[PDB]
């Protein structure tokens, strides 16, 4: 509750007391020591899930995938004490992280054996069996989507930064469609405010009736942002949320822009994306009445390195919405190419 | 943006970037000082308003009144040096600060001459004249309410190199029933939130579902709390806001409680108030279906010093909702004495 700050526009500095919110995206976080319940209980859950037709998992957040990847080996070594022949196999992740109709259960009992799950001093190995328990990757054929799980972990405590940086988790006991609360924080000071979490950071400004300023996106979640953690909820309709409600956008008057509607066909397959309201390099976003209609977002960069400069639209208000990705510039649905074809270009695979 | 943030919860030192609340209420004058626009144009305004019969502005906030009883002297001097005949006066405010109908004008130009700010300006004294432009004061009989003023000032910037704030201000040209947005801040981080103003500090928490935790009130405004600085403004109706909407309460689920409704007849005249959900000393609030209905707020201390030790109600989530005042402890409307008549106890002033 106690601390300090230092302003930038004015140089006044002061310590005091209050409530403090921090940015935790640009550095991709540090490396931490995750403690998912007792990894033995997680292993028992992975068994009882296979027994009932669950054959894989699709991560809800990159933290979940990294926890899986970092506990893969001990997961395989923890079941071999008893009569279980499963073999987890963790691959890379893809964007966006489509949902899963199943849910990992909650075991009432646990595999009786040693407690050696945490921090085994090296020398951990196991023998590969016939049947896998895949996690992400290209294992679609081995385990069809309808048999995959999604969104079954709930944070509990993430302190211990001075000496252990330990983040604790658990398997959630109830069905739900909304993101994790404990890692969300939002604040407002006069003419500015922000919504954010571990992977989401959203900024709003008081220009006139408030609007959307900027946002940085390293993953593409697909949960729903809780309403208790958003500003000025009522009076808004879901047809005008710039970040679709399906991609965990918040319902707010700060989450919008005059002239633009929900962006459901955007480049949600890129690895990293920055939402910025400004014209991309070489671009001249005109305003025309003869221009076309909404359509899938078209990258400004061709697979051959070619780019298209002139785009038009009717309903837009400058500056224009654009996504910045390591691949290149991706524009919004409203702004279509002014004369160039909408198909002889690197079109976003339909993200509807 | 960078800050200490010594996280008292985990005893963890931190650093980074973000946004920070500050509890600038309790350390009221250790930080804040207020001065208006150039008192020459303010003098011109008060001159062009007296033509319409303005009695003189009653303050909405302690900042405005404490500016009133700071800039009087040079305002009087600037009035006199121009040949104008008027005497500005100031008294002691009384809670609550009622809603006056009129509004100050805005001069199109300044007086061509008058620079009495120079030299020993503040301390020039002159006799009292026939014309009184009374600010605040006990002149309620001398000037009826309808000719007063209310809410005629805006904040534009604050923070200066004098190691204390120098809040710039100026006269309003716009009609408005809304509280000031520049000096208000709120935020939520995990399981904690806070609604903060220069005289209001309101704390909310997530137990089961969001609710109200504590409030510290040094003044009792009567402007409307803006919505854009409010969390979860949806699906809530005015009948349950514990702090009445008319007395500058925020419309939120965080500003509610189970078993309580709007408190219109609370002790909104006291010098200093704090809302704490704990029983007043020497008392215990029961819940019974046989208790009486709503009524005026009743203090727990009799005029002779005696206190009552039995209270009841029907619909309250037990036990307390109490206001902490300089002269005693005030209970809520829904809680009323069990044996003593309401006639003997000190009763809240008429604030319906």
């Amino acid at each position: 509750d106690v601390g300090c700050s230092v302003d930038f526009s004015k140089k006044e500095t002061r310590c005091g007391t209050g409530v403090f919110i921090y940015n935790d995206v640009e550095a991709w976080r540090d490396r931490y020591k995750y403690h998912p319940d007792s990894p033995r209980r997680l292993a028992a859950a992975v068994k009882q899930a296979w027994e009932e037709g669950i054959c894989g998992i699709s991560s809800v957040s990159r933290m979940e995938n990294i926890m899986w990847k970092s506990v893969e080996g001990e997961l395989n070594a923890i079941l071999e004490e008893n009569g279980v022949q499963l073999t987890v196999v963790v691959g890379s992740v893809k964007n966006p992280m489509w949902r899963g109709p199943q849910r990992l259960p909650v075991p009432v009992n646990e595999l009786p054996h040693g407690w050696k799950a945490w921090g085994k001093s090296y020398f951990v190995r196991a023998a590969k069996t016939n049947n896998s328990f895949v996690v992400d990757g290209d294992t679609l054929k081995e385990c069809p989507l309808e048999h995959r799980a999604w969104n079954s972990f709930l944070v509990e405590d993430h302190g211990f930064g001075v000496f252990h940086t330990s983040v604790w988790l658990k398997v959630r006991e109830d069905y739900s469609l909304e993101c994790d609360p404990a890692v969300i924080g939002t604040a407002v000071k006069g003419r500015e405010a922000a919504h954010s979490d571990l992977g989401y950071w959203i900024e709003s400004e008081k220009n006139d009736t408030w609007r959307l300023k900027r946002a940085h996106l390293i993953e593409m979640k697909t949960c729903e942002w809780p309403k208790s953690h958003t500003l000025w909820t009522d009076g808004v309709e879901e047809s005008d949320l710039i970040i679709p409600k399906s991609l965990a956008g918040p319902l707010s008057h700060h989450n919008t822009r005059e002239g633009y509607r929900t962006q459901v066909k955007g480049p949600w397959h890129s690895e990293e994306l920055e939402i910025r309201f400004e014209e991309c390099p070489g671009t001249k976003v005109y305003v025309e009445e003869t221009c076309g209609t909404r359509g899938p977002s078209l990258r400004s960069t061709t697979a051959s390195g070619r780019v298209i400069e002139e785009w038009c639209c009717r309903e837009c208000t400058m500056p224009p919405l654009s996504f910045r990705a390591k691949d290149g510039c991706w524009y919004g649905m409203e702004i279509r190419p002014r004369k160039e074809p909408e198909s002889n270009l690197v079109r976003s695979m339909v993200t509807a | 943006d960078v800050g200490c943030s010594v996280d008292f919860s985990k005893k963890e030192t931190r650093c980074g970037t973000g946004v920070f609340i500050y509890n600038d209420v309790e350390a009221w004058r250790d930080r804040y000082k207020y001065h208006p626009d150039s008192p020459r144009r303010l003098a011109a305004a008060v001159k062009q308003a007296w033509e319409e019969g303005i009695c003189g502005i009653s303050s909405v906030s302690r900042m405005e009144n404490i500016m009133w009883k700071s800039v009087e002297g040079e305002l009087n001097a600037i009035l006199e040096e121009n040949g104008v005949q008027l005497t500005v006066v100031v008294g002691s405010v009384k809670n609550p600060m009622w809603r006056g109908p009129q509004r100050l004008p805005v001069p199109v130009n300044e007086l061509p001459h008058g620079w009495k700010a120079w030299g020993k300006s503040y301390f020039v004294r002159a006799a009292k004249t026939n014309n009184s432009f009374v600010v605040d004061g006990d002149t309620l009989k001398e000037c009826p309410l309808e000719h007063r003023a209310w809410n005629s000032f805006l904040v534009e910037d604050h923070g200066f190199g004098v190691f204390h704030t120098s809040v710039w201000l100026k006269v309003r040209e716009d009609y408005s029933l809304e509280c000031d947005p520049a000096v208000i801040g709120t935020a939520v981080k995990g399981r904690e939130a806070a609604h903060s103003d220069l005289g209001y500090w309101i704390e909310s928490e997530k137990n089961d579902t969001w609710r109200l935790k504590r409030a510290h009130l040094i003044e009792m405004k009567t402007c409307e709390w803006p919505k854009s600085h409010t969390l979860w403004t949806d699906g809530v109706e005015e009948s349950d806001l514990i702090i009445p909407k008319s007395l500058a309460g925020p419309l939120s689920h965080h500003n509610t409680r189970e078993g309580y409704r709007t408190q219109v007849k609370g002790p909104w005249h006291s010098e200093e108030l704090e809302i704490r959900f704990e029983e007043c000393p020497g008392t215990k609030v029961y819940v019974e279906e046989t208790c009486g209905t709503r009524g005026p707020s009743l203090r727990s201390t009799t005029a002779s010093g005696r206190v009552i030790e039995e209270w009841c109600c029907r619909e309250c989530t037990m036990p307390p909702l109490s206001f902490r005042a300089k002269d005693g402890c005030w209970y809520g409307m829904e809680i009323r004495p069990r044996k003593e008549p309401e006639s003997n106890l000190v009763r809240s002033m008429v604030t319906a």
Partner: antibody, heavy 116, light 109 residues
Framework: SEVQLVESGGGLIQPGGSLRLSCAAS????????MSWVRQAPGKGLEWVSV???????YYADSVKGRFTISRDNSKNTLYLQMNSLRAEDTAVYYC?????????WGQGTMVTVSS | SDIQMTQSPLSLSASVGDRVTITCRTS??????LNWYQQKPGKAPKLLIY???SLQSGVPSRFSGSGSGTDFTLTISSLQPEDFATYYC?????????FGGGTKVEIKR
């Protein structure tokens, strides 16, 4: 007890009147589940009215916006729907359903008639 | 915008021992959130098949479903006298939780 939903509070009301429906629940808490209201007209299909999440958020069907309001009493574990400005075309049988991985539990229903 | 849930056929005729096929269609990819309910005249619906491939506990093993994307299906291996009712499909993906247009199966003659 067994998991069930039991409505009550139907009858005959003149146009423009008002009424409030109650759907009790047992075997689980409304606060940690997703609950809905479903209605079917005589001789027609099913239709969904409203939902109240476990986090408190609520959504309503377009045709009943403003006029209706869904809430719950956490002490008695009850689910409420407020019916104001009843029309003639609001005649149907109303059910409450629980969502876990599909509306796997339903209530018998209650009949509401609006005739002058 | 909401999601439409057309059904077909409106009604079909088939005798005991036949194999019947019904189709429910949706206007955009709802992942695999599809439900099938069996309502008899004047009764509340009940759930047969969820997840588009899974089987609610207790349902007899003659029911099965399949499909992906915008096209799903349901089938009964050996229709029986007591299966004279209507079948509604539903999706619990995003609000509003729309229902289907209904189909009535003539078990006899």
């Amino acid at each position: 007890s067994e998991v069930q939903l039991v409505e009550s509070g139907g009858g005959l009301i003149q146009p423009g009147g008002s009424l409030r429906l109650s759907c009790a629940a047992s075997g689980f808490t409304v606060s940690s589940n997703y609950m809905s209201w479903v209605r079917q007209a005589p001789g027609k299909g099913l239709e969904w009215v409203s939902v109240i999440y476990s986090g408190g958020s609520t959504y309503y069907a377009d045709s009943v916006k403003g006029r209706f309001t869904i809430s719950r009493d956490n002490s008695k574990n009850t689910l409420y729907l407020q019916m104001n400005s009843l029309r003639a075309e609001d005649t149907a049988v109303y059910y409450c359903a629980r969502d876990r991985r599909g509306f796997d539990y339903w209530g018998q229903g209650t009949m509401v008639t609006v005739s002058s | 915008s909401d999601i439409q849930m057309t059904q077909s056929p409106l009604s079909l005729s088939a005798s005991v021992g036949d194999r019947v096929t019904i189709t429910c269609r949706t206007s955009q990819s709802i992942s695999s959130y599809l439900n099938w309910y069996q309502q008899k005249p004047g009764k509340a619906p009940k759930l047969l098949i969820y997840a588009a491939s899974s089987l609610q506990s207790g349902v007899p093993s003659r029911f099965s479903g399949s499909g992906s994307g915008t096209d799903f299906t349901l089938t009964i291996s050996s229709l029986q006298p007591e299966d004279f009712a209507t079948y509604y499909c539903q999706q619990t993906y995003s609000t509003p939780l729309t229902f289907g247009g209904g189909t009535k199966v003539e078990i006899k003659r």
